[PDB]
Paper text:
Transporters of the Nramp (Natural resistance-associated macrophage protein) family import divalent transition metal ions into cells of most organisms. Recent bacterial Nramp structures reveal a LeuT fold, three stable conformations (outward-open, occluded, and inward-open), and identify the metal-binding site residues, including conserved aspartate, asparagine, and methionine residues. We present high-resolution structures of DraNramp in three conformations in both Mn2+-bound and metal-free states, providing the first molecular map of the entire Mn2+ transport cycle.
WT and WTsoak are nearly identical, confirming that the soaking process does not influence the conformational state. In the occluded structure of metal-free WT DraNramp a density we have assigned as water replaces Mn2+. In contrast, metal-free WT has a more ordered orthosteric site, suggesting a stable occluded intermediate in the switch from inward- to outward-open. Interestingly, both metal-free and Mn2+-bound WT DraNramp crystallized in the occluded conformation, whereas the open conformations were achieved through conformation-locking or mutations of functionally important residues. Overall, our DraNramp structures suggest that the occluded state is most stable (at least in the absence of a membrane potential).
Author numbering: 45 to 436
Write the structure that this text describes.
């Protein structure tokens, strides 16, 4: 199931942190970012899936086989830094949820998260299917809980409507908008989606290829449509809960359960932390898997899976020992992810426009143009953020 295993990446602790902080701090004014980032991810992941189906190779493999050696090395290094920033929010997200449930310190929440992840990687595919369905049950129901709560919260509809008009509000709004974009336009999934779809054809025919393109387009847009509604609901619920009210630590993930207290009652604290834990544990295991596939595609070899798991844990323990706020680091990691998006888009936009790669499945010129517009917008947002964080 290519869409379902990677689907948890669109509901990782990074999405929780950016949705809650965005609503509590900036009200409904960033709803247009979630809508834009979700629409971009529809185009981008469609192209990524169409690359694996049409060519039979994933994006890192094609970069390795077609581009000069130093450019490939640069692309592996930046994708490796994307994998670490992706794992930091997910690993620390599960570690934070351990604290919300047991009260353990973050260091001990990370140790438990460390033991579970190490134990989770050794398991086979048949033993993880009950766990993958279980985490899907927790996260989906919490998502549906926000879809229902956004109605019951009675949000100010004048503010909700104005939030869909693209507007920024200070240098801090650009920082969180970039974090929202990276939390939905995830570069590691841009490389991963082309590998999930490679090797799903039956008789190598163009007719079988177009069919998998049609079927994937239906599944991606439907799943992205659901995740987008959940993300906007969670931000809108967080806005109706905390924005304007003078609540201490409003937007932090330790108090995010209060968004569902009128609906779930005293159970809201546990049901949010369990969903945050299942979100962080599964997406961290998926990312470690994806990080292995991406390295094998770029370099033709990999490091042992236990070594990759151990390396990506170090920035999580260091952040804990520095006393940094976990919700802050979750947001920052999503910001770093959004900076690796243009690097992923450039080969994706070039390869899906070539006939010697796609065959009869060359992307229509209009969507290639839409793809380059998306790349330019994200480059400019990353340039406006970098500029405002330096000076002026
Ligand atoms: C369904 C999930 C969609 C999520 C998309 C992003 C959030 C924007 C949606 C707002 C709908 C809220 C409707 C709640 C009712 C509107 C309030 C109203 O019209 O008056 C009711 C009155 O206050 C009672 O007495
Ligand atoms: C949405 C964030 C992750 C939530 C986890 C649920 C994923 C929902 C996607 C498809 C449902 C399953 C459809 C099964 C058929 C697709 C092939
Ligand atoms: C984190 C990994 C990305 C940053 C570290 C660079 C990875 C690397 O090994 O760099 C290639 C070096 O030239 C080989 O000797
Ligand atoms: C699986 C069974 C429940 C999970 C862990 C045991 C929880 C009990 C151990 C924690 C003792 C203190 C406590 O009651 O947890 C409240 C915590 O402070 C709230 O944030
Ligand atoms: C990374 C810094 C060094 C790490 C040193 C910590 C070693 C903890 C080992 C076992 C205790 C685990 C107890 C909590 C897990 C329950 C199983
Ligand atoms: C698989 C996931 C696919 C969606 C799951 C369907 C569940 C709810 C619809 C989601 C939209 C939320 C609609 C809420 C309407 C509602 O709850 O009505 C309350 C009423 O206003 C006062 O009781
Ligand atoms: C088309 C324009 C219709 C909505 C334009 C905004 C009007 C307004 O101020 O709010 C109305 C409503 O609450 C917002 O959905
Ligand atoms: C602007 C409005 C586009 C709206 C929806 C496009 C979604 C479907 C577009 C797919 C392009 C169809 C195509 O020609 O190539 C795909 C392949 O042939 C098999 O559909
Ligand atoms: C085809 C798949 C669906 C798209 C995938 C994402 C999932 C749903 C996203 C948004 C729902 C519609 C929200 C669009 C914004 C409606 C509010 C609006 O535009 O009117 C407000 C007015 O303009 C203020 O002045
Ligand atoms: C430099 C970045 C970390 C280097 C990790 C190397 C050894 C860690 C200890 C390995 C212990 C696990 C042995 C597994 C067999
Ligand atoms: C790869 C790590 C690079 C820089 C970490 C050290 C620089 C610290 C910047 C991290 C951002 C942060 O979380 O700290 C907030 C503060 O505003 C910051 O000056
Ligand atoms: C920041 C701007 C966006 C990233 C640009 C760099 C990405 C690819 C350039 C590599 C050259 C591609 C070689 C084509 C053959
Ligand atoms: C002035 C501020 C910027 C101005 C506005 C942004 C324009 C620059 C952004 C992208 C360039 C478009 C890249 C065009 C490269 C595609 C053409 C091409 O070479 O075809 C691809 C083929 O598939 C490969 O072999
Ligand atoms: C800036 C926000 C932009 C929002 C824009 C929303 C419209 C995108 C809707 C569906 C994705 C369409 C799929 C992307 C293009 C793939 C279809 C295609 O061209 O496929 C050709 C070939 O026949 C097969 O490989
Ligand atoms: C949701 C989209 C909002 C729409 C406004 C956003 C602006 C995006 C830029 C271009 C749109 C795509 C149109 C690209 C037209 C030039 C490329 C093209 O398609 O030329 C081939 C054509 O078939 C020869 O007849
Ligand atoms: C506000 C931002 C608006 C930026 C508008 C134009 C620059 C990006 C669009 C130009 C993209 C050039 C690539 C292209 O049009 O098609 C390339 C393909 O290789 C040919 O078949
Ligand atoms: C300016 C538009 C460029 C478009 C995006 C290109 C990415 C830029 C390269 C590295 C970003 C620095 C972040 C490195 C990680 C910092 C960790 C603190
Ligand atoms: Cl307001
Ligand atoms: Na926190």
């Amino acid at each position: 199931g290519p869409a379902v295993i990677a689907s948890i990446a669109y509901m990782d602790p990074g999405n929780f942190a950016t949705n809650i902080e965005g609503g509590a701090r900036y009200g409904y004014s960033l709803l247009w970012v979630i809508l834009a980032a979700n629409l971009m991810a529809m185009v981008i992941q469609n192209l990524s899936a169409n690359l694996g189906i049409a060519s039979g190779r994933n994006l890192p493999e094609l970069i390795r086989e077609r581009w000069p050696r130093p450019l490939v090395w640069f692309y592996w290094i930046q994708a490796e830094l994307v994998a670490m920033a992706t794992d930091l929010a997910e690993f620390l997200g599960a570690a934070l949820a351990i604290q919300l449930l047991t009260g353990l310190p973050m260091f001990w929440g990370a140790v438990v998260t460390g033991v579970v992840t190490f134990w989770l990687l050794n398991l086979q595919k048949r033993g993880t299917r009950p766990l993958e369905l279980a985490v899907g049950a927790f996260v989906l129901m919490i998502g549906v809980a926000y879809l229902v709560q956004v109605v019951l919260a009675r949000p100010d509809l004048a503010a909700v409507g104005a939030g869909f008009v693209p507007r920024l509000q200070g240098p801090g709004s650009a920082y969180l908008a970039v974090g929202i974009i990276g939390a939905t336009v995830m570069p590691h999934v841009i490389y991963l989606h082309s590998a999930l779809t490679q090797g799903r054809i039956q008789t190598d025919t163009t007719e079988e290829k177009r069919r998998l393109v049609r079927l994937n387009r239906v599944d991606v847009i439907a799943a992205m449509g659901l995740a987008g509604l959940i993300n906007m609901s969670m931000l809108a619920v967080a806005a109706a809960t905390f924005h304007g009210k003078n609540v201490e630590n409003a937007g932090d993930l330790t108090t995010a359960y209060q968004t569902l207290t009128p609906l779930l009652g005293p159970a809201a604290s546990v049901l949010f932390a369990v969903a945050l834990l299942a979100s962080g544990l599964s997406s961290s295991a998926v990312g470690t898997m994806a990080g292995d596939v991406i390295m094998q595609g770029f370099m033709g070899f990999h490091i042992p899976l236990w070594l990759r798991r151990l390396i990506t844990m170090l920035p999580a323990f260091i952040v804990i020992l520095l006393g940094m706020d976990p919700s802050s680091v979750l947001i920052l990691s999503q910001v770093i992810l959004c900076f690796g998006v243009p690097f992923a888009l450039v080969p994706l936009l070039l390869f899906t426009a070539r006939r010697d790669v796609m065959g009869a499945l060359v992307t229509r010129r209009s969507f290639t143009v839409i793809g380059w517009v998306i790349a330019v917008i994200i480059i400019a947002l990353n340039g406006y953020l970098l500029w405002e964080l330096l000076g002026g």
